[PDB]
Design an enzyme around this catalytic site. Structure first.
Site, short mmCIF file in Angstrom:
data_model
loop_
_atom_site.label_atom_id
_atom_site.label_comp_id
_atom_site.label_asym_id
_atom_site.label_seq_id
_atom_site.Cartn_x
_atom_site.Cartn_y
_atom_site.Cartn_z
NE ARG A 110 -2.70 -1.67 3.38
CZ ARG A 110 -3.29 -1.68 4.38
NH1 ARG A 110 -3.37 -0.73 4.95
NH2 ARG A 110 -2.95 -3.18 5.71
CD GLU A 284 2.12 -11.84 -3.70
OE1 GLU A 284 1.00 -12.10 -4.28
OE2 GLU A 284 2.39 -9.91 -4.14
C1 HEM Z 1 1.90 -2.55 -6.69
C2 HEM Z 1 1.60 -4.19 -6.34
C3 HEM Z 1 1.42 -4.56 -4.69
C4 HEM Z 1 2.16 -5.57 -4.22
C5 HEM Z 1 3.83 -5.74 -3.95
C6 HEM Z 1 1.24 -5.94 -3.69
C7 HEM Z 1 1.25 -6.84 -2.60
C8 HEM Z 1 0.35 -7.88 -2.04
C9 HEM Z 1 0.12 -9.57 -1.14
C10 HEM Z 1 1.99 -10.42 -0.45
C11 HEM Z 1 -0.77 -9.69 -0.78
C12 HEM Z 1 -1.04 -11.24 -0.34
C13 HEM Z 1 -1.56 -11.82 -1.26
C14 HEM Z 1 -1.71 -13.51 -1.15
O1 HEM Z 1 -0.92 -13.33 0.23
O2 HEM Z 1 -2.87 -14.22 -1.86
C15 HEM Z 1 -1.79 -8.47 -1.23
C16 HEM Z 1 -3.48 -7.99 -0.61
C17 HEM Z 1 -4.28 -8.00 -1.60
N1 HEM Z 1 -3.87 -6.60 -2.79
FE1 HEM Z 1 -1.81 -5.84 -3.18
N2 HEM Z 1 -0.20 -6.07 -4.08
C18 HEM Z 1 0.41 -4.94 -5.06
C19 HEM Z 1 -1.28 -3.61 -5.56
C20 HEM Z 1 -2.10 -3.90 -5.14
C21 HEM Z 1 -3.02 -3.19 -5.73
C22 HEM Z 1 -2.88 -2.20 -6.50
C23 HEM Z 1 -4.81 -3.07 -5.48
C24 HEM Z 1 -5.86 -3.09 -5.30
C25 HEM Z 1 -5.89 -1.53 -6.33
C26 HEM Z 1 -3.97 -4.52 -4.24
C27 HEM Z 1 -5.45 -4.14 -3.20
C28 HEM Z 1 -5.01 -6.11 -2.83
C29 HEM Z 1 -6.04 -6.93 -1.59
C30 HEM Z 1 -7.24 -6.23 -1.97
C31 HEM Z 1 -5.20 -7.39 -0.78
C32 HEM Z 1 -6.50 -8.57 -0.38
C33 HEM Z 1 -6.65 -9.89 -1.32
C34 HEM Z 1 -6.43 -11.38 -0.29
O3 HEM Z 1 -7.32 -11.30 0.91
O4 HEM Z 1 -5.69 -12.14 -0.55
N3 HEM Z 1 -2.70 -4.70 -4.05
N4 HEM Z 1 -1.12 -7.57 -2.31
C1 LIG Z 2 -1.79 -17.75 -1.14
C2 LIG Z 2 -3.00 -17.59 -1.35
N1 LIG Z 2 -2.78 -16.49 -2.20
C3 LIG Z 2 -2.98 -17.02 -3.62
C4 LIG Z 2 -4.41 -16.16 -1.76
C5 LIG Z 2 -5.02 -15.54 -3.37
C6 LIG Z 2 -5.31 -13.79 -3.46
C7 LIG Z 2 -6.93 -13.76 -3.42
C8 LIG Z 2 -6.59 -12.78 -2.87
F1 LIG Z 2 -7.71 -11.64 -2.89
C9 LIG Z 2 -6.25 -11.91 -3.69
F2 LIG Z 2 -5.96 -10.48 -3.77
C10 LIG Z 2 -5.02 -12.23 -3.98
O1 LIG Z 2 -3.44 -11.22 -4.32
C11 LIG Z 2 -1.88 -11.56 -5.06
C12 LIG Z 2 -1.35 -9.97 -5.22
C13 LIG Z 2 -2.29 -9.12 -6.08
C14 LIG Z 2 -2.32 -7.74 -6.43
C15 LIG Z 2 -2.90 -6.66 -6.85
C16 LIG Z 2 -0.22 -7.88 -6.31
C17 LIG Z 2 -0.18 -8.44 -5.66
N2 LIG Z 2 1.63 -8.19 -5.84
N3 LIG Z 2 -0.22 -9.52 -5.20
C18 LIG Z 2 -3.74 -13.18 -3.66
CL LIG Z 3 -0.61 -14.97 -6.74
#
Ligand code: HEM
Ligand SMILES: CCN(C)CCc1cc(F)c(F)c(OCc2cc(C)cc(N)n2)c1
Ligand SMILES: [Cl-]
Ligand code: HEM
Ligand SMILES: CCN(C)CCc1cc(F)c(F)c(OCc2cc(C)cc(N)n2)c1
Ligand SMILES: C[C@H](O)[C@H](O)[C@H]1CNc2nc(N)[nH]c(=O)c2N1
Ligand SMILES: C[C@H](O)[C@H](O)[C@H]1CNc2nc(N)[nH]c(=O)c2N1
Ligand SMILES: [Ca+2]
Ligand SMILES: [Ca+2]
Ligand SMILES: [Cl-]
Ligand SMILES: [Gd]
Ligand SMILES: [Gd]
Ligand SMILES: [Zn+2]
EC number: 1.14.13.39
Lengths: 403, 402
Positions: A110, A284
């Site tokens: 963020r 990831e």
């Molecule tokens: C720009 C580089 C970004 C990086 C490095 C990043 C990184 C991450 C990571 C590592 C997660 C955990 C997801 C998982 O573990 O599966 C996450 C979750 C999330 N990201 Fe970011 N993100 C980025 C951009 C964004 C953008 C552009 C948005 C929306 C406009 C966003 C919205 C979200 C949301 C809603 C989650 C929660 C989804 C969940 O519950 O898994 N992200 N992000």
């Molecule tokens: C390992 C468990 N994971 C795969 C859960 C799946 C999952 C569900 C979800 F709703 C997410 F937004 C999500 O976001 C990955 C993500 C999104 C964005 C924009 C950036 C980065 N860098 N990464 C990933």
């Molecule tokens: Cl992913």
């Protein structure tokens, strides 16, 4: 009522005054904490959220209580009185999309929240224009490997009408196929969406990295199968800077993390189709996607290739194999010039975000379990930062699958 | 319905029905979760006592029996007459094991049934307290074949001060606040170190100086006791293939023995009840040696390893930290001191969770504390949803006595 929040590496204290705005309730109660759970469970309604969002917006632009403020209020009232819903001004849309990202407690990235390209697709009809909206998004966001954050906002939910839905959880997904030997070839995560494609027309490949078609749904129509041009989907074959055999494993990942199945909520309005993309943090891909036991689960493969001692846990062969897979990821994306960020740089940036956000609005909703990386947790500064998790609006939410 | 709990590695679903019996409230609300925060009377005591008594007779399959009825009546009468009561000996053993079983932040609870309980309730002085602690250390160490143990000093009672062990653990390295503002030794121990000096201890100047104990008999100031060097087993740290590692002069001690928590059983409070098990390697290798506010050796080790410490993307931090954990495990195995790596420990905790689901229909667990500090998602507990809540008997944090 203001939580005390400590950092144990430094000793600094802050107080989260912003948690008091928590518009909705989370899963936890005084009797038990459920913070680890992934999914943790009329016109008068819509007005109070919509009103509250507009003050948010006008307070955000230092022009609140103003004539322009009071006029938007009576606009949305009359709009809802005449239609049952209301339409966002494009700038309110841009603001609400950035805020929803800013409000996501589980996103470590963020620091980037103020820089988001918003594509207004609210005038979209039928799935073919969906597909065109999505392909432009992909090509803009990919940008030949110089990744740029974007979101595309499709028509909001409204009564009487169906819903715009992207059946795929991400824009780029690798197929997962079942064998009669019971295992999965490809990504086990995508088994169900994969068979839906086959059952909605698609003819299945048989590789470990077969990019899925898109099942796009326009209101009240069945979903339509669309294929993405390979020239559109940028991928990174994985090699290791010093382990010459790693390339031979045939591993690869895609450039663009583009989440397509979460619901976007702004001012009481709901957009069930609003795919958003950023760039990847290396863990990831190289820790969760490739080494989770229920994903590609390659860790032992790699460990065997490194001639590690896999018959005793205490040699830490799993840890050594995982580190090299992540090194493989980082080196490969840098070699292909695809934007990537390692878990150390990312978490150091998040700490800066915490500090910035403490000043901007007295706190930051943050979900410790998702912010701390899945390798080297305590080697990053977020491990030693107490966090407060709560739900603000506008927000991204999970939602039921369309089927 | 009770909280539905999913294992994401396997797909499986459980319901934690045990959480509905949680007593003392935690720090979360529906408006905000604080699970990440480190630190967040007659009829009251009777309900606590009676529930404990009930837990005791349940454990021995004699619930609702005559002895069960009579012991409740007996406890009630003593509380009526005196405002407090005494545990039977068998209740103290059972209470202490339940407090461990109930500790949500302990990943080593597969062992909870194997706990040596030393009854020091007849302790009367700080000298006798020291003797009990030495016997505990000797028994638990067992020349490196570590045995889990707890020594229970006299419970709190009205009109008399508490027994307290001022030290956070029985074995702790000195942390000397430097005239620069830096620390020589363990920075986690700067406070207790300063209280030892102030109470007569002649300090050393090493980085691994074992502290004396400050023991507090009721209504007395703390008294200083030096542990006999031969009672404190320590492991020189070396690396199996990095021969320069030995020249770093690093050491840790064998016995993890926590001495500053309050043990609570059936409403009764034991403010001094030090307990010990054996180490999980990441506690030493990752936290104690690599935390920035602890020994903070990560960069030195990586430099010595000739890793490129100027870009984070080389993952020099992860590689050095792994080898430091390797050295720890190798060195404890070589010294023949019990130790458990984070993969075996988390795999045993999955077995414990499964046992407790069958035994009680749930298990209080603090996910952030159960998941190890390196290689988190490589362990099975990462993908296990957990429910965090407080049962009694319990080990509780308590204010520092100074
Ligand atoms: C720009 C580089 C970004 C990086 C490095 C990043 C990184 C991450 C990571 C590592 C997660 C955990 C997801 C998982 O573990 O599966 C996450 C979750 C999330 N990201 Fe970011 N993100 C980025 C951009 C964004 C953008 C552009 C948005 C929306 C406009 C966003 C919205 C979200 C949301 C809603 C989650 C929660 C989804 C969940 O519950 O898994 N992200 N992000
Ligand atoms: C390992 C468990 N994971 C795969 C859960 C799946 C999952 C569900 C979800 F709703 C997410 F937004 C999500 O976001 C990955 C993500 C999104 C964005 C924009 C950036 C980065 N860098 N990464 C990933
Ligand atoms: Cl992913
Ligand atoms: C026998 C082997 C044991 C192992 C491997 C083990 C493991 C662990 C670990 C790694 C932690 C995390 C501590 C931290 O990071 O600060 C912990 C916490 C804890 N352990 Fe265990 N332990 C063992 C024995 C015991 C025994 C015998 C007891 C009590 C009788 C106990 C009670 C606790 C408690 C109460 C905590 C929580 C402390 C807190 O909240 O800070 N453990 N344990
Ligand atoms: C890194 C910061 N942390 C270590 C704080 C110190 C601490 C606080 C605490 F309350 C504890 F119970 C604790 O016990 C660790 C422990 C205890 C036992 C019996 C066995 C093992 N194996 N380990 C250690
Ligand atoms: C059960 C547990 O909450 C689950 O495995 C969580 C833990 N932390 C996570 N952290 C991230 N970044 N992504 C995840 O999917 C998860 N999964
Ligand atoms: C702020 C955060 O809750 C704190 O650093 C916790 C996280 N999880 C932990 N888990 C264990 N086992 N030990 C710890 O010291 C911590 N520290
Ligand atoms: Ca068959
Ligand atoms: Ca008696
Ligand atoms: Cl410790
Ligand atoms: Gd070979
Ligand atoms: Gd060597
Ligand atoms: Zn909580």
């Amino acid at each position: 009522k203001f939580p005390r929040v400590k950092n144990w590496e430094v000793g600094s204290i802050t107080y989260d005054t912003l948690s008091a705005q928590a518009q909705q309730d989370g899963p936890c109660t005084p009797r038990r904490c459920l913070g680890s759970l992934v999914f943790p469970r009329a016109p008068e309604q819509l007005l109070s959220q919509a009103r509250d969002f507009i003050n948010q917006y006008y307070s955000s632009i230092k022009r609140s209580g103003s004539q322009a403020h009071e006029q938007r209020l009576q606009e949305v009232e009359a709009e809802v009185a005449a239609t049952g819903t209301y339409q966002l001004r494009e700038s309110e849309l841009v603001f609400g999309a950035k805020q929803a990202w800013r409000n996501a407690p589980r996103c470590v990235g963020r620091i980037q929240w103020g820089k988001l390209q918003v594509f207004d697709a609210r005038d979209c009809r039928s799935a073919q224009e969906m597909f065109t909206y999505i392909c432009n998004h992909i090509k803009y966001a990919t940008n030949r490997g110089n990744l740029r954050s974007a979101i595309t906002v499709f028509p909001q939910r409204c009564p009487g009408r169906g819903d715009f839905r992207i059946w795929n959880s991400q824009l780029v997904r690798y197929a997962g196929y079942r064998q009669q030997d019971g295992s999965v070839r490809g990504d086990p995560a995508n088994v169900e969406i994969t068979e839906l494609c086959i059952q909605h027309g698609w003819t299945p490949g048989n590789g470990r990295f077969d990019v899925l078609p898109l099942l796009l749904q326009a209101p009240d129509e069945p979903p339509e199968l669309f294929l993405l041009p390979p020239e559109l989907v940028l991928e990174v074959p994985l090699e290791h800077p010093t382990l010459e055999w790693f390339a031979a494993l045939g591993l690869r990942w895609y450039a663009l993390p583009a989440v397509s199945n979460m619901l976007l909520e702004i001012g009481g309005l709901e957009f069930p189709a609003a795919p958003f993309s950023g760039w990847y943090m290396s863990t990831e891909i190289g820790t969760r996607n490739l080494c989770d036991p229920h994903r590609y689960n390659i860790l032992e493969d790699v460990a065997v290739c490194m001639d590690l001692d896999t018959r005793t846990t205490s040699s830490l062969w799993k840890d050594k194999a995982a580190v090299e897979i992540n090194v493989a990821v980082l080196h490969s994306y840098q070699l292909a010039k695809v934007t990537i960020v390692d878990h150390h740089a990312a978490t150091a940036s998040f700490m800066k975000h915490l500090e910035n956000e403490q000043k901007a609005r007295g706190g930051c909703p943050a979900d410790w379990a998702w912010i701390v990386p899945p390798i080297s947790g305590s080697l990053t500064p977020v491990f030693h930062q107490e966090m407060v998790n709560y739900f603000l609006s506008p927000a991204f939410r999970y939602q039921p699958d369309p089927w």
